[PDB]
């Protein structure tokens with residue numbers, strides 16, 4: 019994709035902190051950038067759209083290469099168009115913004131400078147942040163996570179990609195998404211079909227695969243921490259159903275792990291721990307600490323979770339499912355959890371902990387998003403039963419308090435139009451350097 023010249027692209031400033039062993043922390047001057055899929059895409063020769071709503075202009079885009087040559091991503095009005103506002107160390111994302119047009123959700127990335135994403139290697143470190151999910155009802159997902167996207171957005175070896183990280187280009191994740199308009203420096207017009215339900219999306223012939231660390235996927239009802247492995251941890255391109263993942267006809271046939279090794283306190287049998295008025299009270303802001311412990315050789319072997327709220331340091335809840343003990347993500351837990359729930363261990367199949375270790379060494383980009391789910395209505399995160407026809411007596415089926423008919427986008431984009439999430443006070447450093455409490 020080309021650089022559009024009709025609207026200035028200004029990345030909203032966002033501060034975050036780096037801490038060292040002593041507990042002392044310094045402030046970084048970061049910036050946020052909107053993912054390329056949300057942007058206006060128009061001709062390099064004027065204002066004619068290359069894409070509108072769910073449909074490509076086939077004169078401007080008769081093939082994937084020519085499209086990339088002809089089409090430019092332009093600047094975004096973060097607050098007015100997308101409901102994205104950054105102030106100090108705080109990033110707020112609104113679910114629905116009714117400006118001149120209707121916008122639903124957003125996906126943003128943390129930048130080091132105006133043409134490079136910030137990268138993280140969190141091995142033997144912790145990533146910590148505050149969040150307010152009180153405005154997130156059933157069906158919403160405020161996600162804060164990491165993927166090994168190229169720091170420059172792909173420009174160094176993609177001749178038709180000039181827009182790069184400056185315009186939020188380069189997304190990949192563990193579902194090998196095919197809804198991306200631009201993948202590895204080519205458009206995705208070939209094979210494109212508009213979505214059956216979503217006015218503003220579709221799927222193309224190719225998908226964008228990489229490893230994915232879902233540090234945080236949550237609403238006011240439930241939360242999940244889920245690493246996902248991949249054969250090759252950085253971006254690879256796939257075609258059609260061989261991609262695997264959500265919109266494939268054969269979910270587990272690809273080169274990535276679409277399910278991950280998840281820890282949702284509710285799914286692990288504790289319904290009293292996280293939610294409204296619970297031990298982690300989603301009525302109020304709380305701190306989320308995620309620690310990445312290593313073996314003697316520097317490979318990842320455990321992800322621990324702590325919360326801080328109202329001054330109290332709260333350990334992660336123990337899994338109470340018979341055969342699945344502990345409160346952290348380890349190889350023992352992942353093995354046990356997949357065996358006991360009867361889920362396919364694609365986490366292990368694509369390299370597991372060694373894969374995530376490789377992902378961190380390659381460098382992870384921080385992603386902060388808010389979305390609804392046209393595929394499964396976020397029932398995997400918050401439903402009384404997923405699948406909706408499964409027996410709630412069977413361990414692993416129940417994930418939250420939401421009904422099996424909750425979270426339908428056409429419903430919630432109206433009924434939850436005021437929904438939002440606020441991520442704030444990001445801190446990174448050695449284990450136990452980023453937080454304190456009783």
Ligand SMILES: *[C@@H]1O[C@H](CO)[C@@H](O[C@@H]2O[C@H](CO)[C@@H](O)[C@H](O)[C@H]2NC(C)=O)[C@H](O)[C@H]1NC(C)=O
Nearest residue numbers: 082206207208209210222223224255256257258
């Ligand atoms: C991107 O996906 C498109 C669509 O599937 C692929 O285009 C096909 O390419 C094959 C091989 O050249 C042709 O036989 C077909 O005619 C194309 N199909 C369509 C619908 O145009 C393209 O190969 C993919 N890109 C990559 C890098 O795999």
Ligand SMILES: *[C@@H]1O[C@H](CO)[C@@H](O)[C@H](O)[C@H]1NC(C)=O
Nearest residue numbers: 061066067068075076077078
């Ligand atoms: C597609 O782009 C061409 C070239 O700019 C333009 O003339 C035409 O009106 C566009 N077609 C549609 C259907 O938008």
Ligand SMILES: *[C@@H]1O[C@H](CO)[C@@H](O)[C@H](O)[C@H]1NC(C)=O
Nearest residue numbers: 309324331333448449450451
């Ligand atoms: C860090 O803090 C946790 C929570 O209090 C504690 O369990 C652990 O022993 C500490 N580890 C280190 C390396 O300081």
